[PDB]
Amino acid sequence: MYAVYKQAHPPTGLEFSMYCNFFNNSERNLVVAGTSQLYVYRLNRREKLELAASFSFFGNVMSMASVQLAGAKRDALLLSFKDAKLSVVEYDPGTHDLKTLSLHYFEEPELRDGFVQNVHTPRVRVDPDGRCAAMLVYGTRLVVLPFRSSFLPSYIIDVRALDEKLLNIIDLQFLHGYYEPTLLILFEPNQTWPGRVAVRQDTCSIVAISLNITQKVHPVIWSLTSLPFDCTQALAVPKPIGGVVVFAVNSLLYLNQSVPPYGVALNSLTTGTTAFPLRTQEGVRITLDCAQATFISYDKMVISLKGGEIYVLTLITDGMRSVRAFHFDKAAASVLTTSMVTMEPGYLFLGSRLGNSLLLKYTEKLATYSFEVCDSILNIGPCANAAVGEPAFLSEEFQNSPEPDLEIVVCSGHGKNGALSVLQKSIRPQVVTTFELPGCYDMWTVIAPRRHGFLILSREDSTMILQTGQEIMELDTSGFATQGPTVFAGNIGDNRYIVQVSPLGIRLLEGVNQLHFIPVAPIVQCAVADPYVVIMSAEGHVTMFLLKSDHRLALHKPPLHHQSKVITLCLYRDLSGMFTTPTHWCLLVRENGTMEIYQLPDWRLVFLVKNFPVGQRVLVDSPLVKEVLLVALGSRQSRPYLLVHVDQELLIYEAFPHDGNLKVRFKKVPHNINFRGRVARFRYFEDIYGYSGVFICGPSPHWLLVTGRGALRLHPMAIDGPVDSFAPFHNVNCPRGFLYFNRQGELRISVLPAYLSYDAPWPVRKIPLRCTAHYVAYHVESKVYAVATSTNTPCARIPRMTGEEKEFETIERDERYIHPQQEAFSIQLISPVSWEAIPNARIELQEWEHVTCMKTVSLRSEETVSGLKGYVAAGTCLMQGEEVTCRGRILIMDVIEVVPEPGQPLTKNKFKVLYEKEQKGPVTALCHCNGHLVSAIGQKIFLWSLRASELTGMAFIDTQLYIHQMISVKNFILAADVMKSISLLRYQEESKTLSLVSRDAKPLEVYSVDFMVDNAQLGFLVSDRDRNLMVYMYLPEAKESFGGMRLLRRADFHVGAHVNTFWRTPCRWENKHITWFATLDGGIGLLLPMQEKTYRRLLMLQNALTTMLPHHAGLNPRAFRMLHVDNAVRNVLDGELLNRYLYLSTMERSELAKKIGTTPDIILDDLLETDRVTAHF
Amino acid sequence: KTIDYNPSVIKYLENRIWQRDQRDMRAIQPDAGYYNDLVPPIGMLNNPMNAVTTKFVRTSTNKVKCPVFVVRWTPEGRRLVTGASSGEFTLWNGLTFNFETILQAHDSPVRAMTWSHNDMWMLTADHGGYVKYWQSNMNNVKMFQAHKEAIREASFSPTDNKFATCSDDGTVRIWDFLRCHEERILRGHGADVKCVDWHPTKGLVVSGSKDSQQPIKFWDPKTGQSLATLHAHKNTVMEVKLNLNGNWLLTASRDHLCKLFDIRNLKEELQVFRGHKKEATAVAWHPVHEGLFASGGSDGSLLFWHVGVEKEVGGMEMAHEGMIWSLAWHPLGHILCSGSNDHTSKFWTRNRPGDKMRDRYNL
Question: Which of A188, A190, A974, A989 has the smallest number of CB atoms closer than 10 Å to its CB?
Fold first, then answer.
């Protein structure tokens, strides 16, 4: 009943993209957007896109456009949301978030025109000259937004109240030229269907309505009424030529008001379907049906077809700025795009949901172009089926951890970009050498003559040194003072001189030989970085050293005015810095509660925050801080991050430029982490496996990474418990790697595992298949994966049923003809040892056959010590059109170890198919129930028993239309229909009887089903076609159901994305399982069941968080998570809104708890237990 | 000879993953080789011109040759029961339409036939006045007598509790389901009533008539009082139907017209539906495409309509022989059946891609 939705992975897969003045009028920015998330990209120079801002929304972006208002310094964005919401937002300086300029709620009962089910999506379009902006609401209304307080009040134009009776609309653009903002509109007054073209040949029309802003009237000019029947999008040709090109599935037109309609055909499928006068384009046979296109300057057009192929159309222009003909050429292929944008002249971004959206570079060939691929953007595509599996190379030091160690494998992408994605949370290190060193609590690694030479361990009474190299060995001679503890030890200069500090004295060093000694309230910590040393005692005294060649450290006692005592320090330099007014900076935190940044050669106050230890979101110039660290991260050490440690709670800041002080401010960034002599916790590392960043030590270790993407990455590390200390380590027997202490006092020489990629929000290995991944199934015995794949071949035959046999008909057409796609399926076998496909192990299916399901079926057997064996079973059936009776085949597979072929270690595993027999009808789903194969053939659900060689039927029921999903636990079969509902079953074992317990009486189109598991409550989690989640329970004693026949929904929640996969894992809460799922728009989510008493303390929080916080784009987090309207029994909490309780400062954190009647000490114990129990994968 | 819906649903579940919409859908091209790209009408949700079912399939005729009145699908789509004039239920197969079984339900011409909102029960009336319940295995369960004259149409509540029978004596009597108890009588109608549709949420009962003074009467099943009166047609409303959304009232009559009405606004009138050259005797709303419906004629004109277009989308003039009494779409909105005043019953499916529609029904 009572649950919480939490989001473990943000969604990947960009739908929208443009190129506007987001930050300022000087440079431009790639602004991409996806399912409920907005990104802003810069462009560094090899070229690479750098992330500059990322924004999350409580609503799915349905359209996007950018138009630069009058007098504004930036380019506003026009975000369109679902059921007619427009939202004009801008970037904000000062505070770094989005400032929202306008909202426009247009959801009315009188605008839907009686139609309940909204099918059409809202579409924002803008003027080339920036005069107005239009939204097509519902397909029946146009909303005009006039521009020059910078707006004008809108007015809704009824489309069907115009001339020519618009009806079906296709695409609408604004045209060029045209002193009034002319809006072109494609429409269909009499809609028809491809397949019914003999009574309706072609009905597509164009009206260029000319909009008077002032008079608020609009006359129709320039009508055309006989365009071909299937027209997709229209493109406004730019200013020197003008007009419009109208793509069709089989043709291509150019239309203008004075020029006659020039249009060519592309393939010979406009023979009897199009009576519009069309020419023949020479030597080209393609189709424009899902094609994205943009204009390069003018008279050039890059077209990304389906299949990913890029063409360049040049509009061959005569002297009179008319169009004579078209010219095509086949340039290089690329991703299956969902967007298309020209950036700076020479670049193209290709935003794709499915496949890695990448950036191109084009130069002319010696007007013919060639395309180069710059750095792509990683993308987990439409996650179709995903299976939980175990990794292969976990080290032997970590073998006896009680929690399971496992990872998920995701069928991402589609088609040519079809792939597998090996996703994995917290980093599992490779331990290559371990020690057992008690007593020593700190550690350091310095470079001696760029491998690390010395390992400097600080005990409570003495100091250990280690000599490294070929064979690491403990050092005995002079150099470091080993008579006491050392509080810091680090390189000064440029990896030439070593400096350690003891609480009495401060030693330089050149290696094994001491240079000299400087004596000094014991020293508690030091900041030895960038040829400047600053040493701080326990009473709050600060003194500075400095290398001076003649090299020698020189005391410069800083001029400082201590009205309150300094608690902690940091030092920082700008390789590629924004700190303007390389330059060195001292950061200093006094005990009164303030932060002070100091320019280091002088000591003048440059930056000052008056109330620092609270945790405010954005800082501006003029408790018990533990540790503060400023570090640069990214390309050429560009962007700095501030990291503090205040009352068991880690808060990190960004830095962004904002106009005799520093021209910067610090923006707070969210977390998932709690912190629940002096030892440092924020230990910066440079070049561990190429990755630079921060390791964060404590009860929950977290790797902080920023690569050349510019994106912040937090990766936990939960194996080997809490970690006390850490140091980078580069050796001979250990490569670029790292080095840490266990809590049980065990030093571990370690290397990151090299098969993953830590640049993504989870460490992921993207495995290209170059074919569509449909299903995946981890086989527990022998530890491999079984993937059903498909590839597109051109079709050539047509099956018939002539009463005695099948008779095939050869598709015999013209040589200028595109072929239908016939898909051939094949079952792979993937090895987790190295992720290559295992050779000589591929089951290839029949000529027309389609795998409809693959699961890891645990059938019982007479062989092993248990009953079960865990087979792989595939249900598969033939699609030969509607006039041929569809029959199926059940395919049971067993992966068997054999002797390997010499030179081929991966070939020790091979399929053995126990069962392959054609059934009586299509096989659509499969299951296991106490060792019984449960299959759904047609409108029956059989329950098989596998004997030594064959299946034997035991029981069935007559079920509904098309059961496509089935799951079960403990003889309760759940089912799922395409149109109707779920319908739970039950199987008495003693009599061979299968029975229907209950069913959802309402019609509901289900994607996939799961089992919400509580202590004794078993929920039935269901995702449907409207982007929702719902939990049905079988409650016989209730009276709002009928007696044991109707199911009752108990929790409602509007996830923003479709869901196909479902994983139940135990909990890292007596028997409460987490029902994980991976959303179809890229991300991964959770449902965690709770008790009622914990639930209603957080429902009171969420109602206060919804009202009292300025959400992005003026949205409502309550109405976005209401059921299906984007009869609601909501019981799932918005854990991505409850996660915004952590982001509030502790002054504002306590005001909400006093307004709802509790203390924030309870709510942090309420929230952070949901983060601890959900740290799987 | 078969029309199998399985290779369209399997194609739909494979497109569902990487299609997010219909604007993303790879277009079917008008050719005889793109037969695998057909999706059911859940797939192409806009472009409802999909399910304008003008491809002939099969004439289901009996051996007894009796004129049929009601034809309804089993709610799993598995088989077609057919109500003829001899009281016989001839059960037609749902894919390969050959024959399954024949019953003899009533002693009269069967006039009404409804399935419940689950697959449990089936209400049937007849020309004598008897109302029987029927389980999904076509077993005869408790019968009674509802009217002393011929019942014409039944339909019922948004639950399985309470049905309404309209008859030729002029009363719409509201019944309890389990008790078989006549709860109340809705009198004051003017003449015999020939159709009743229950509202899918709000609990309304809308009745037709032959009377010109009180042609359409709204009702109230709890109070029993007539809520409002609609004066829509000149004569003899044959059918009255409602959507599944509950905003619209569709009404067919003998004045060659079909008319939409918003039940929230009765004083005005929505669009009218001409084109039936003879009387318009039957209406079947489409299940998944809200706003498009087939239409029968007394001469045999089978037409397809859509809410928003003034002319029809396109149908079959003079092509279905006889007078059409009732129509029933499959639970997937892809095939259609019609019940003739002839001794036959014909099945209509969607046109194939790329075919030349040159047969005796289209051109």
Answer: A989
Contact B49/A at CB under 8 A:
yes
Which residues in B38-75 are b (16+ Cβ under 10 Å) and which e? Answer: bbbbbbbbbbbbbbbbbbbbbebebeeebbbbbbbbbb
Pick from A127, A212, A130: nearest CA to A172 = A127
> Tokens standing for A597?
């940044």
Question: What are the tokens at A1169?
Answer: 């237990």
Determine the Cα–Cα distance for residues A60 and A80; give it in Å rounded to an integer: 8
**Nearest Cβ partner for B362 among A195, A199, A958:** A199
Nearest CB neighbour to B76, from listed A198, A818, A939:
A939
Quote the minimal CA–CA distance from A417 to chain B in Å. 12
Which residues between 105 and 124 in chain A have a beta carbon less than 8 angstroms from any beta carbon of chain B?
Answer: 114-117, 119-121
Q: What residue type is assigned to position A609 of the chain?
A: V
- Could you tell me if A327 and A281 are in contact, meaning their C-beta atoms sit under 8 angstroms apart? no
Cβ–Cβ of A195/B37 closer than 8 Å? no
Rounded-to-integer distance, Cα A242 and Cα A320, Å: 12
Q: How far apart are the first and last CA of chain A?
A: 25
**Rounded to an integer, what distance in angstroms lies between the CA atom of residue A1000 and that of residue A1004?**
8
DSSP string, B272-320: EE---SS-EEEEEE-SSSTTEEEEEESSS-BEEEETT-SS-S--BSS-S
Say whether residue A1040 is in contact with chain B using an 8 A CB cutoff: no
Q: What are phi and psi of A1168, to 5 degrees?
A: -75, -10
Which of B27, B248, B353 lies at the smallest CB-CB distance from A114? B248
Residue of B nearest to A887 (CA): B6
Contacts of A819 in chain B (CB under 8 A): 33
Q: Do A886 and B34 touch (CB under 8 A)?
A: no
Residue linked to tokens 């007007």: A367
Distance from CA of A1086 to the nearest CA of B (A): 20
What are residue A913's DSSP bridge partners?
A893
CATH top-level class of A3-376: mainly beta
Amino acid at B31: D
Count of residues making up chain B: 363
> A1155 — phi, psi (to 5°)?
-80, -20
Task: State the Cα–Cα distance between residues B271 and A861, nearest whole angstrom.
Answer: 67
Chain A 773-832, residues with CB within 8 Å of chain B CB atoms: 774, 795, 798, 801, 811, 818-820, 822
Q: Which of A626, A629, A677 is CA-nearest to residue A502? A: A677
Q: How far is the CA of A368 from the CAs of A240, A298, B277, in angstroms? A: 22, 15, 62
Other CB atoms within 10 Å distance of the CB of residue B258: 25
> A961 and B356 in contact by Cβ < 8 A?
no
Angle at A511 between CA A507 and CA A512, to 5 degrees: 90
From the list A559, A585, A488, A556, the residue with the least C-alpha distance to A527 is A488
Question: Are A167 and B308 a contacting pair at CB < 8 A?
Answer: yes
Nearest to A882 among B8, B17, B356 (CB): B8
* Resolution value, angstrom units: 3.4
The Cα-based distances of A1089 to A921, A1015, A1066, A1123, B126 in angstroms read: 40, 9, 12, 19, 54
Experimental method used, please? cryo-EM
Return the SS3 of B12.
helix
> Which residue among B3, B78, B118 sits closest to A882, beta carbon to beta carbon?
B3
Radius of gyration of chain A (CA): 33
Contact A879 B10 (CB under 8 A): yes
What span, in angstroms and rounded, lies between the C-alpha atoms of A484 and A487? 10
What are the contacts of A510-513 at 24+ separation with CB within 8 A? A511/A448, A511/A449, A511/A453, A511/A479, A512/A448, A512/A475, A512/A477, A512/A478, A512/A479, A513/A478, A513/A479
Site of tokens 């002797």: A899
> ∠ CA(B288), CA(B293), CA(B297), 5° rounding?
150
